[PDB]
Ligand binder design. Sequence first.
Ligand SMILES: Cc1ncc(COP(=O)(O)O)c(CN[C@@H](CS)C(=O)O)c1O
Ligand SMILES: Cc1ncc(COP(=O)(O)O)c(CN[C@@H](CS)C(=O)O)c1O
Ligand SMILES: [K+]
Ligand SMILES: [K+]
Lengths: 386, 386
Amino acid sequence: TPDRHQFPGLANKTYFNFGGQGILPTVALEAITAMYGYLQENGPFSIAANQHIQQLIAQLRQALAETFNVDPNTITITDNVTTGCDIVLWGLDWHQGDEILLTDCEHPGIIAIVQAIAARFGITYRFFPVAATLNQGDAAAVLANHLGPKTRLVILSHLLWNTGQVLPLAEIMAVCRRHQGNYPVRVLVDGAQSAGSLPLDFSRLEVDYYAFTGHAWFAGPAGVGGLYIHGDCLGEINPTYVGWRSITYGAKGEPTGWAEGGKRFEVATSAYPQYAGLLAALQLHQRQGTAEERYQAICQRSEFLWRGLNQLPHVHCLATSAPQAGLVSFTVDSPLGHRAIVQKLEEQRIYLRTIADPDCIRACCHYITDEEEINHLLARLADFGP
Amino acid sequence: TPDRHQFPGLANKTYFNFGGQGILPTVALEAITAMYGYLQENGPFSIAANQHIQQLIAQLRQALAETFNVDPNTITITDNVTTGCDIVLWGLDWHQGDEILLTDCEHPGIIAIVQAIAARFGITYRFFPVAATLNQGDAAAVLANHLGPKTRLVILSHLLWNTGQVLPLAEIMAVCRRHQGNYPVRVLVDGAQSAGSLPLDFSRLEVDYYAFTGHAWFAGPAGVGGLYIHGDCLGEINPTYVGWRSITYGAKGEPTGWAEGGKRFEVATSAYPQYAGLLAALQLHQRQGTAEERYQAICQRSEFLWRGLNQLPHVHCLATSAPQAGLVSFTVDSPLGHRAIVQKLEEQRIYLRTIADPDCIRACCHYITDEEEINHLLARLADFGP
Ligand SMILES: Cc1ncc(COP(=O)(O)O)c(CN[C@@H](CS)C(=O)O)c1O
Ligand SMILES: Cc1ncc(COP(=O)(O)O)c(CN[C@@H](CS)C(=O)O)c1O
Ligand SMILES: [K+]
Ligand SMILES: [K+]
């Protein structure tokens, strides 16, 4: 039984955009405001304040580590999902002619990094079709049919932001591992949608690099994210953007080496109070139940919505079977067009989003979502037709 | 006449750490809290919320542009000073053998980036002594005696964080411009201390690249900063860390190019409410008077402190003439040591900081600082002796 009162934003609106940004819980707002008060009272720049901040950073790094069942050393703190991807990509020792493989469902921001890399190191990239594997086929097999001699890295979203498909990461990892080419194939995972909705254990699940953010499904504030790097891959990633938070210091205050673990990829001054906000949101989710129970709760709500949409004659879900996670994508048979339909809905305080490719509308159902909100969505969607 | 009441943190303490982080003005805390409320009420992810954020970003970009008297197109928004430096350094098309010159008073974080670059592109770097030019000599001349055939970039702090000297930037720029080698010599300026205290007009002052932050002298919240790049140098800087905020989009939502001006160096989701905070702080400073009046106010206070320290027999200021800005560094003749002396002072709610090189203590005087706080500092410093 979810405590909806902890998320005051739920009232007087019908929110289905958790995948864009989660509704901020009261405890998170409180922790943010309290941090500003602490800095004002004790600093903001001083021995006591600087200590309190270092302690806060360590507490967030630890909560994130526990979240994925890994050691604090494998966790880097960033501001969003993308930065984590920039860290891995710019850190690899790319050689002219190396190749990168991406699914055809990756975020335009990520593709932009790859383009920048290709132009800088003369590497090449190409996509492999996974979108079409929502209701049939096998993305792992598709990848196998694309792996080549110079394939060095594969980039994929564990949960696709556009179609709602949960890719078979374990199988894809194996495929990459057994492959034999000029490089051991490594996989960078974009977890923008998976983290905070899917139960994730990186000690029971082999992963090389996993990027995520705290402002979507974890419901933290905009501006705080993180990155996971398996201990065996750390060496392969050279720090790129660095600062006073990336190194260790000498007797005269000079740089003497890299800071321990993932700290070497952290740059400098950040919005610390936001860190306290994410910490509070993380702890609030553990008090609501285990990751597994929250995931099933999410799936019960997504299936309820999915089922409701199947009944609507002019609505067509992309998934022919029950959603594997909280994302439900669909099209609407109407002359208006999806963009105008999302605006009409927002006019009635119903919040969903449009998806560019494929051209559809997407609803996100979280464990705090209830049947009344879903029925209200269904009621309004019912007014559109050909 | 400064309105000290706008900075509630001033009361019940004696703050001299503006150069580390400024005291947050009430109006900034209000704007931060209001932004969280707007996102909760209208989103946080939605058409209305996304529009409000884009408008907020444009307003801050413009206020910063106006601050330095330049075009909005030359301003990039970052999270701190260091990131601006990473953008310029990683963006240049380095060639094996190129050389970088840095003064012997640059931040250890900046030096760390240069070492990372040297190791990646095989470039070399060396320092030129400016610390000793606080009371005599000429840093521009020192630079002239260090310029070489392969010198491509020079890195310097406009206002030195350790000694408090204001380098002759105009002269240094001329020296670099008239030099003839294999490259036109460009200069990256670290303005962590200069921005917000020194009056800066980049349309009257020739500058290639100028990095800064909003949480020190501008008194904004930790986590928001920016970078200036002259329109003629924009083409030389290749975007490195990029994301969905760095590009323009196509018909199917795919990347089609770089976003206009400085936006190409912005990555992805950020702490937007903090942006509103910096905007509010920036506007509060203009209501207090012009940049010139605030600078003179700052200098009157620094000289007052400097003069008071000259009277103390066991205190020795590094500057033999009146400080050129708000930073006042000095040593103390005592067996205790500077670190122990900064801690005792903090125990009395008097806030200063230690400096590693040279080994001294630094006080920062802002236009909101008053004679009573300075006398209280002098009173307490008087108890230390050999
Ligand atoms: C799959 C995916 N990858 C990256 C992002 C970008 O996240 P940051 O801003 O770097 O944290 C996203 C974002 N998704 C939401 C906004 S476009 C959404 O509405 O799905 C991904 O989905
Ligand atoms: C000259 C200089 N350059 C960079 C910084 C780092 O700033 P960010 O954390 O990137 O904003 C600094 C910082 N100075 C303060 C210590 S962190 C200080 O008190 O001097 C510079 O001074
Ligand atoms: K249907
Ligand atoms: K003296």
